[PDB]
């Protein structure tokens, strides 16, 4: 017998003690080795309720990633609360590694194995584990990168679809690669992302059809962000320590519903912190080819309000709350206390 409960989790990873890469360093001192032979118990015809939108596991992963960035990516100048903090800001080795989240004695993690599970409600196929799967703490907006894929159909996730103020997480069942490069050798900050147009438009059409099922077959329209900070209006992410801001206008235009899609990007030194603090400024980009090839595995969407009297629903890429990023991976888990 058990019950829903919150407790302090610990982490496990396969980090290398000899790596200077910041994630490896953090996990080496903050986590333990992973279990080579993990045990999993499938509960016989047990029904459990989940709520990915109210899961303390999310808050804890957030806290880990905040501390990791706080120790690994200190900017030259921090602007928060009115005070100005200056300090050294050397370039680092940066490449996210999988982090496992595990429960201590007296506790266990319940895992929903239901196909097409949306993250909330009852789960029929439930198993118990000590640790989650390996989750890379990838920080980004608009597009979710290097995450897990839905096993069956594309899944739409939201705490409340009817509430347009609540973020929508689209969980893809097929990866679309995004190839971002800052070429070696008139602007060290100019960059670009290449994406297979055929693959993207096909997936996006599948997402459209999926959104129809949730919005009474209303017409689904995609549009670029209306306004807001650059971190939100553009696809923001960190590649090799450098902050990339990419213009995704070409991705979200309800027209191509063929060739290569080249998104214009730029590396920014001055960033609005996702931690919520304030503003941070980093040193200029390192020289040479700066390249990151990522899997697009999900999308963060915000729905336009004031469309109730029309046959259209408008969706725009969003994000900014990194907790949603962790939710996209932790949705199927919950902690319970055993006796
Ligand atoms: C809640 C709300 C509206 C979200 C905002 N988000 C961000 O500034 C953000 O996500 N920035 C960011 C930075 C680097 C990378 Br790489 C990706 C994204 C920041 C705060 C202060 C928390 N307000
Ligand atoms: C329940 O989930 C487990 C783990 O994914 C899977 O092996 C099993 O086939 C599922 N059971 C059914 C009947 O769907
Ligand atoms: C998830 O599935 C449950 C099944 O009862 C349902 O109540 C809930 O509305 C679903 N959530 C979404 C966003 O589809
Ligand atoms: C992805 O999900 C959609 C439904 O959302 C489905 O039609 C399609 O077959 C899936 N693709 C793959 C490769 O499973
Ligand atoms: C979902 O959002 C709608 C629109 O804001 C609201 O009227 C409704 O109460 C919400 N549903 C729940 C279960 O809170
Ligand atoms: C990229 O996506 C493919 C599946 O489309 C997967 O096999 C591979 O592991 C992914 N790479 C990651 C997760 O970094
Ligand atoms: C990514 O794009 C760059 C520049 O076009 C290219 O050199 C590289 O081969 C690409 N990588 C992959 C895996 O497609
Ligand atoms: C969408 O249209 C199809 C085809 O007529 C219908 O079967 C289905 O019930 C509709 N779905 C919604 C959510 O309105
Ligand atoms: C993206 O590029 C388009 C032109 O292709 C431009 O109109 C738009 O302002 C850009 N978006 C942002 C957020 O800068
Ligand atoms: C969508 O693409 C078409 C291409 O002809 C363009 O004219 C239109 O302005 C685009 N809408 C946007 C970028 O919102
Ligand atoms: C995208 O993939 C398809 C095969 O799925 C291929 O035919 C097409 O050439 C690719 N497009 C690009 C831009 O490479
Ligand atoms: C995604 O994973 C690939 C393979 O490990 C990596 O090269 C790339 O830098 C990752 N993308 C991001 C945004 O971290």
Author numbering: 44 to 124, 198 to 301, 324 to 355, 357 to 396, 411 to 492
Authors' text:
The HIV-1 viral spike is composed of three copies of the gp120 envelope glycoprotein attached non-covalently to three copies of the gp41 transmembrane molecule. Binding of the primary cell surface receptor, CD4, to the gp120 component of the viral spike exposes and/or induces the formation of a site for co-receptor binding (either CCR5 or CXCR4). The NBD chemotype consists of three essential regions: Region I, a para-substituted aromatic ring; Region II, an oxalamide linker; and Region III, a tetramethylpiperidine heterocyclic ring system. Herein, we present the high-resolution structures of NBD-557 in complex with clades BYU2 and in complex with clade A/E93TH057 gp120 core, as well the structures of four Region III NBD-congeners, AS-II-37, AS-I-261, MAE-II-167, and MAE-II-188, in complex with the clade A/E93TH057 gp120 coree.
Concurrent with this study, our endeavor to crystallize unliganded HIV-1 gp120 core led us to identify clade A/E93TH057 extended core (coree), which produced well diffracting crystals in the absence of sCD4 or CD4i antibodies. The clade A/E93TH057 gp120 coree, however, required mutation of His 375 to Ser (H375S) to co-crystalize with small molecules. In both the NBD-557:clade BYU2 gp120 coreV3s:48d and the NBD-557: A/E93TH057 gp120 coree complexes, the Region I para-bromo substituted aromatic ring was inserted most deeply within the Phe 43 cavity. Comparison of the NBD-557:clade BYU2 gp120 core V3s:48d complex with the NBD-557:clade A/E93TH057 gp120 coree complex demonstrated that the conformation of NBD-557 was nearly identical, with only a slight deviation of the tetramethylpiperidine gem-dimethyl groups. In the NBD-557:A/E93TH057 gp120 coree complex, residues Thr 257, Glu 370, Ser 375, and Ile 424 made contacts with the Region I para-brominated aromatic ring of NBD-557, while Trp 427 made an aromatic-aromatic π-stacking interaction with Region I. Along the neck of the Phe 43 cavity, the nitrogen atoms of the Region II oxalamide linker formed hydrogen bonds with backbone carbonyls of Asn 425 and Gly 473. In Region III, the gem-dimethyl group at position 6 of the tetramethylpiperidine ring formed hydrophobic contacts with the Gly 429 backbone Cα atom on gp120. The tetramethylpiperidine ring made additional hydrophobic contacts with the gp120 surface in the cavity vestibule. Overall, the structures indicate that only the oxalamide linker of NBD-557 makes direct hydrogen bonds with gp120. Regarding Region III, which binds to the surface exposed vestibule of the Phe 43 cavity, the NBD-557:gp120 structures indicated that the amine of tetramethylpiperidine ring does not bind Asp 368 and that the contacts with gp120 were not optimal.
